[PDB]
């Protein structure tokens, strides 16, 4: 019987290490005008602007290439005891996954 420790150890997300400047494959699951919401297997989705080049191919279910910058955007502000989160990951949309 596999324990939680083994699952965590052999998880791809654990294996990736630091998320900064890592290339990942995401899937579009929601589109609001020109804003694409993409899941890449993390806790949060990332929202990207539709590119001006071949923008019509970006549809729901489309696989895209992302360069991750942050798995979650948080920051502590003056006079606060806890971080403020926007509940969103930071990523750069590169193109379609051929």
């Amino acid at each position: 019987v596999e324990s939680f420790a083994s699952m965590l150890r052999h998880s791809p997300l654990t294996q990736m290490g630091p998320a900064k400047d890592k290339l990942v494959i995401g899937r579009i699951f929601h589109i609001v005008e020109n804003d694409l919401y993409i899941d890449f297997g993390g806790k949060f989705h990332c929202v990207c602007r539709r590119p001006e080049v071949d923008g019509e191919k970006y549809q729901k279910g489309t696989r895209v290439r992302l360069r991750l910058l942050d798995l979650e955007l948080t920051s502590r502000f003056l006079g606060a005891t806890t971080d403020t989160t926007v509940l969103e990951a930071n990523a750069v949309l590169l193109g379609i996954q051929e």
Binding site: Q15, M16, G17, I25, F40, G41, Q97
Partner: peptide
């Protein structure tokens, strides 16, 4: 992790992209 660190500093991030949806994905670093 130590090995991984060295890898990501020497060979850099693999041009191949990660697929976290696959529960058994195997990177070049792995």
């Amino acid at each position: 992790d130590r090995i991984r660190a060295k890898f990501y500093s020497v060979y850099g991030s693999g041009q191949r992209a990660f697929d976290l949806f696959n529960p058994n994905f195997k990177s070049t670093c792995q």
